[PDB]
Write a protein that binds this ligand. Structure first.
Ligand SMILES: *[C@@H]1O[C@H](CO)[C@@H](O[C@@H]2O[C@H](CO)[C@@H](O[C@@H]3O[C@H](CO[C@H]4O[C@H](CO)[C@@H](O)[C@H](O)[C@@H]4O)[C@@H](O)[C@H](O[C@H]4O[C@H](CO)[C@@H](O)[C@H](O)[C@@H]4O)[C@@H]3O)[C@H](O)[C@H]2NC(C)=O)[C@H](O)[C@H]1NC(C)=O
Ligand SMILES: *[C@@H]1O[C@H](CO)[C@@H](O[C@@H]2O[C@H](CO)[C@@H](O[C@@H]3O[C@H](CO[C@H]4O[C@H](CO)[C@@H](O)[C@H](O)[C@@H]4O)[C@@H](O)[C@H](O[C@H]4O[C@H](CO)[C@@H](O)[C@H](O)[C@@H]4O)[C@@H]3O)[C@H](O)[C@H]2NC(C)=O)[C@H](O)[C@H]1NC(C)=O
Ligand SMILES: *[C@@H]1O[C@H](CO)[C@@H](O[C@@H]2O[C@H](CO)[C@@H](O[C@@H]3O[C@H](CO)[C@@H](O)[C@H](O)[C@@H]3O)[C@H](O)[C@H]2NC(C)=O)[C@H](O)[C@H]1NC(C)=O
Ligand SMILES: *[C@@H]1O[C@H](CO[C@@H]2O[C@@H](C)[C@@H](O)[C@@H](O)[C@@H]2O)[C@@H](O[C@@H]2O[C@H](CO)[C@@H](O)[C@H](O)[C@H]2NC(C)=O)[C@H](O)[C@H]1NC(C)=O
Ligand SMILES: *[C@@H]1O[C@H](CO)[C@@H](O)[C@H](O)[C@H]1NC(C)=O
Ligand SMILES: *[C@@H]1O[C@H](CO)[C@@H](O)[C@H](O)[C@H]1NC(C)=O
Ligand SMILES: OC[C@H]1O[C@@H](O)[C@H](O)[C@@H](O)[C@@H]1O
Ligand SMILES: OC[C@H]1O[C@H](O)[C@H](O)[C@@H](O)[C@@H]1O
Ligand SMILES: OC[C@H]1O[C@H](O)[C@H](O)[C@@H](O)[C@@H]1O
Ligand SMILES: OC[C@H]1O[C@H](O)[C@H](O)[C@@H](O)[C@@H]1O
Lengths: 400, 388
């Protein structure tokens, strides 16, 4: 979507995976969907390095809506959002963050809250712009294929007409099976900044694998459609929650990064462990995810040993490689060479291990190397021509 | 098996899950299957509280065998076990531990090492007793059903005849589908101290769930056959390795415990985290697993909320309850009462949360309680009647 936004994948925090549709503030005031929850997460994002590392979106998901007023205007739940949404947006903006919100293109939201039907699309867009929202996720429950075909373009047009840049996240393709001919990715790229292609993620490794395997099965279709301003969205990061081991958490971060995915966390930032913070705030990982070329990666190799290799092209003739073990036994010594991974030419390379920081020098196409990969885990390299180091130091500047 | 052994489920360490068939001692000397690995694990068991908490078996699995000598006597691989097996048995015994070993009722072990064919069963039993082994795991790769039907009883008889008490772990039923009519559990109970019913565990939560689900689906058959001296074996604990989250690690420990399973770890004790050590060395958990009645628990309730409740009866009118969440969303507030979980009337109970240590006192059958269960996790109670 050509609205100036999301030239790199969006980074931030979304309420849904961790906090879901918890509205019992009487019994569970610390974890319920409420203005307090968002204000506290905002504070954490401003204070604990998240914003400074690039995590700028704080997004409301389903179950925020109280109803519509006498004029049809959306209102948040007054008991849970007593100061209103404008107050919340002001607060978030005061901390250098952006506010996202949620609506559904259909009769109701997936959890049964008031829907944005076709006759409310424009009014709801205008309301969100008036509240100074910065992002909209538009779900597609309780609608027909025809309503979605009309509604998603209608909302993109309505948002545009407000004059406020609002990042637009579209669930449209997930409801149509994610593939052509039912999904037209050329249109999606013109009307949305990102789109959910496939199933909702759940807090399990099986869920991550299910999503990864669908994206890889269909990468010939999906890889080319992503780029600056228009991303595939494999759904939220699970890091910090209950279902992923350490190796699995590092794997999801690495694989979402190689896929040029949004880095949308959904976890309790108030209690997140240092170990998990270190994964999400890894500066090299983030640089890779945010690479300005915005070229989505691919799986380039799969071995009988159940080791898979993913590669993402990056700026300055660099690459990211993720060596991923689908084994379930023990650490595995994977023997390869850049030549076997379809690197050609006379380039000598160096690599930095993204998680350890260790440098491997003197890699030619023919050079045999070994990486030790843990089960359901990864090894990730930032790989660059060694001449990149010299060229970066030898740029001559003039005042203009 | 009526040999006086394993009147409670065995506790210890088994090499297989974590270390597998790693024989590359040149490239990977710290992690290969070797005398050194077992000695180092024995040292950790003696020094870091494992033995003292009840973890007493140190078990060799596949890939130890070097060949047979001119008399057909089994030998370990001389490069990886230079001092031989008696040396290792004697070492482990000096530390107050027991040594387990591995053989296969068939032409070869599962990884292709020399097998214990029918004509070698007695000689191999005699060799193991001479070496002063304390437990034998007998796998069943590379054999026929008829060979296994002859061989497993033959080995039980041969072990007995040596005069050395050797705990006998039998993989027989796993090769025949684990169920009647092909598996006869009254026969198994007579010839084995424990048996692998089902698939090898792998380092994944999906593997744990697959095993749990098969055990629960067939619990009407499996629950009654377990007892002192004869246990169902759902395979090794994964705690300390790579595939399980913290919640899942706590869940496996609790569920194996309510199932009266062996607690056979398979993890690097040299590098195990404090958090994982605390799960495995939980004294109340171990007390429950080792309960002298040896009554295997059952799943007693399954709710549309995807909360499952397991119960194990214990000594002195006590019980263990495991509240297990199969949800994959977020923590769940599970509302129940002991009356809804079929507890006996007019009794007042006290419960201890096995992981937190918190005490809940004065629970009557009608008393409503809430437990907060994390996704792919558990809450476990040790429950007993009280006066007051
Ligand atoms: C409603 O929808 C319309 C489209 O129908 C949107 O209009 C587009 O808005 C984007 C973003 O603001 C515009 O893109 C920007 O154009 C700037 C100016 O370029 C002009 O000059 C060139 C000359 O060759 C023309 O070709 C071009 O059409 C423009 O007239 C650029 O400077 C901007 O560059 C940005 O990215 C580069 C990265 O390479 C950075 O270096 C810059 O710093 C900068 O960030 C950018 O490309 C686009 O021109 C508009 N299109 C049209 C047709 O007008 C509205 O934004 C949208 N409104 C809302 C509210 O959503
Ligand atoms: C080789 O195989 C033989 C035959 O199976 C084994 O011999 C058996 O060993 C077990 C365990 O030591 C014996 O079981 C114990 O028997 C005790 C008394 O039994 C007497 O009465 C029976 C007839 O009723 C006679 O056969 C026997 O000779 C005795 O005179 C019991 O007191 C023990 O009870 C234990 O369990 C109960 C609950 O189950 C508890 O309440 C008790 O506290 C106690 O812990 C137990 O039942 C069995 O009797 C032996 N059988 C025979 C025929 O000798 C060998 O052990 C085995 N050898 C090796 C090396 O493996
Ligand atoms: C366990 O080992 C025994 C002994 O080695 C196996 O029996 C042997 O099996 C081999 C290979 O199948 C037989 O050789 C073959 O015989 C056929 C007969 O025509 C021939 O066409 C082949 O070219 C080949 O020579 C061999 O005869 C047989 N020997 C004996 C003494 O039985 C047995 O198969 C193994 N069992 C299991 C369950 O793996
Ligand atoms: C979205 O809602 C419309 C409007 O009808 C509402 O929903 C119905 C299920 C019912 O509860 C009505 O009382 C509500 O007002 C649905 O359109 C109706 O669809 C039914 C068939 O289900 C049809 O018989 C009616 O003619 C339709 N009514 C109107 C006014 O057009 C629509 O089907 C709903 N869409 C989805 C995807 O759920
Ligand atoms: C890489 O290893 C193979 C054997 O696996 C060997 O034949 C080859 O010479 C090695 N390449 C180099 C450049 O040493
Ligand atoms: C327990 O709660 C239920 C509501 O689900 C209520 O009907 C019942 O009276 C309560 N029982 C007691 C003993 O308070
Ligand atoms: O090929 C890889 C696989 O090898 C098998 O021998 C192991 O049991 C699996 O856990 C492992 O994933
Ligand atoms: O947990 C996996 C990571 O562990 C260590 O950091 C390794 O050095 C790194 O290569 C690997 O990716
Ligand atoms: O019923 C339990 C289930 O509810 C919802 O469908 C959630 O998406 C799922 O993660 C959870 O396990
Ligand atoms: O991680 C799960 C455990 O967390 C805490 O210890 C809880 O107090 C306990 O009830 C629960 O079983």
């Amino acid at each position: 979507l050509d609205n100036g936004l999301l030239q790199t994948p969006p980074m931030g925090w979304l309420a849904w995976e961790r906090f879901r549709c918890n509205i019992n503030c009487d019994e569970d005031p610390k974890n319920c969907i409420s203005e307090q929850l968002f204000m506290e997460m905002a504070d954490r994002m401003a204070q604990d390095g998240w914003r400074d590392m690039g995590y700028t979106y704080l997004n409301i998901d389903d179950c925020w809506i109280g109803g519509r007023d006498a004029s049809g205007r959306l209102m948040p739940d007054p008991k849970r959002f007593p100061h209103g949404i404008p107050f919340l947006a002001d607060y978030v903006h005061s901390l250098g963050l952006k506010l996202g919100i949620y609506a559904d293109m259909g009769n109701f939201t997936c959890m049964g809250y008031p829907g944005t039907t076709l006759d409310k699309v424009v009014q709801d867009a205008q309301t969100f712009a008036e509240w100074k929202v910065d992002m909209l996720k538009l779900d597609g429950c309780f609608s027909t294929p025809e309503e979605r075909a009309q509604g998603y373009p209608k909302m993109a047009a309505a948002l545009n007409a407000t004059g406020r840049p609002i990042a637009f996240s579209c669930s449209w393709p997930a409801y149509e099976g994610g593939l052509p001919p039912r999904v037209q990715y050329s249109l999606l790229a013109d009307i949305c900044n990102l789109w959910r292609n496939y199933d909702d993620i759940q807090d399990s490794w099986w869920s991550v694998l299910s999503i990864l395997n669908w994206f890889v099965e269909h990468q010939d279709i999906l890889q080319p459609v992503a780029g600056p301003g228009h991303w595939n969205d494999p759904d939220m990061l699970l890091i910090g929650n209950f279902g992923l081991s350490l190796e699995q958490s590092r794997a999801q971060m690495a694989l979402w990064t190689v896929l040029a995915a949004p880095l949308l966390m959904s976890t309790d930032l108030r209690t997140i462990s240092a170990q998990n913070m270190d994964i999400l705030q890894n500066p090299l990982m983030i640089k890779i995810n945010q690479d300005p070329l915005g070229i989505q990666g691919r799986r380039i190799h799969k071995e009988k040993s159940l080791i898979e290799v993913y590669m993402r092209p990056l700026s300055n003739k660099a690459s990211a490689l993720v060596f991923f073990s689908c084994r379930t036994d023990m650490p595995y010594r994977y023997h390869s060479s850049l030549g076997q991974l379809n690197f050609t030419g006379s380039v000598i390379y160096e690599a930095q291990d993204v998680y350890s920081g260790d440098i491997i020098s003197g890699l030619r196409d023919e050079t045999n190397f070994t990486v030790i990969i843990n089960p359901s885990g990864v090894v990730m390299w930032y790989l660059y021509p060694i001449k990149n180091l010299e060229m970066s130091q030898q740029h001559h500047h003039h005042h203009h």
